[PDB]
């Protein structure tokens, strides 16, 4: 019995996690990859059912924004330099084997012109180098070299083009600007926010205009309770209760145009049976 206890104790010393199973429960110990996706998985992907990792959203950090800016600048510099650098290399190669002098001097003059063009490109200002939030940069390279893979190419492209470009006015809104936005939304309709942003004058994205309108809107919530809505709230609460815990966020989304605070107040002050 004592030696069995000792064996138990050594296997305690030789014993050993949950993480090794999580998504690939079956996985190889030489390659570390699980079994191939089931045909059901392929069919699910075909129907465009986003997986949990595909719907995973992470906030854009400030250092990420600065890294994006720097990477885009470097990308544009490289893309504008590679052509002229290659031209200069070709001119040098031709100079190496020209078998002539006057042609060699002409090639030297062309190379000097190319070097001047390269210098001009190098000293280009940041404003003219960034672009116009609609030119095609190498967004996929940024996802690999600049970013270590934490951001996909499409995510970076959308963030740069729609939000983080300098041509998007990120400054705080003004009262006159807000009033103009409200008037344009009312007259032009709340369904063409691209044309609203274009007509707003200031360089703004349709998303920003819609966000500001919603945050200052007054028809977003119903703002008045009705008997039918009260009955719906009571039924939903009685259905989704587990005791004294009433999760109002989950109740809200069966209610139309309501917030959790409104339901909390309504069920605590008026619809409470007590």
């Amino acid at each position: 019995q004592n030696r069995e206890q000792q064996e138990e104790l050594m296997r305690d010393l030789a014993g050993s996690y949950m993480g090794h199973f999580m998504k690939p429960y079956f996985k190889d110990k030489v390659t570390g990859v699980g079994p191939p996706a089931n045909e059901d998985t392929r069919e699910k992907a075909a129907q465009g059912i986003k997986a949990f990792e595909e719907l995973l959203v992470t906030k854009w950090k400030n250092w990420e924004k600065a890294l994006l800016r720097k990477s885009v600048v470097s990308d544009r510099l490289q893309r504008l330099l590679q052509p002229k650098l290659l031209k200069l290399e070709y001119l040098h190669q031709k100079q190496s084997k020209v078998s002539s002098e006057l042609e060699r001097q002409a090639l030297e003059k062309q190379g000097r012109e190319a070097e001047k063009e390269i210098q001009d490109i190098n000293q280009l200002p940041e404003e003219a180098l960034l672009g116009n939030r609609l030119d095609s940069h190498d967004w996929e390279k940024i996802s690999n070299i600049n970013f270590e893979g934490s951001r996909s190419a499409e995510e970076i492209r959308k963030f740069w083009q729609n939000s983080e470009h300098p041509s998007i006015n990120k400054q705080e809104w003004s009262r006159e600007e807000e009033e103009r936005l409200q008037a344009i939304a009312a007259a032009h309709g709340h369904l063409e926010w691209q044309k609203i942003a274009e007509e707003l004058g200031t360089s703004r994205s349709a998303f920003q205009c819609l966000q500001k309108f919603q945050q200052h809107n007054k028809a977003l919530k119903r703002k008045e309770w009705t008997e039918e809505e009260d009955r719906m709230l009571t039924q939903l609460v009685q259905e989704m209760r587990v005791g004294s815990h009433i999760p109002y966020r989950r109740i809200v989304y069966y209610m139309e145009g309501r917030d959790s605070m409104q339901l909390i107040y309504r069920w605590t002050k008026s619809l409470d049976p007590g």
């Binding site: 030489v30 052509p83 290659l86 031209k87 190498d138």
Partner: protein, 88 residues
């Protein structure tokens, strides 16, 4: 993903050689028809790659490949890192 990489490579090559086309004395229309011909014509299993580390055990070969394009079953695939094992 492979078609996107091929298109990007074609665009990069065209942008890089536009200067030579302009300089040597051939119009950019020749460049455009080159791009169109390459794209149109884009439409044995061989893997062309670079080796990071070809380890050889007693009989087990472990291949660490930096990058490569493979031609499996008449379909082209791309990989930026390959960790393979084999038994001679």
């Amino acid at each position: 993903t492979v078609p996107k990489l091929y298109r990007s490579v074609i665009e990069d090559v065209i942008n890089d050689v536009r200067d030579i086309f302009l300089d040597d004395g051939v119009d950019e229309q020749v460049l455009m028809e080159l791009k169109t011909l390459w794209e149109n014509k884009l439409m044995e299993n061989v893997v062309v790659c670079q080796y990071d580390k070809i380890h050889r055990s007693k009989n087990k070969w472990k291949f660490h490949l930096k990058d490569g394009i493979m031609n499996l079953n008449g379909r082209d695939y791309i990989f930026s890192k390959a960790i393979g094992d084999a038994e001679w």
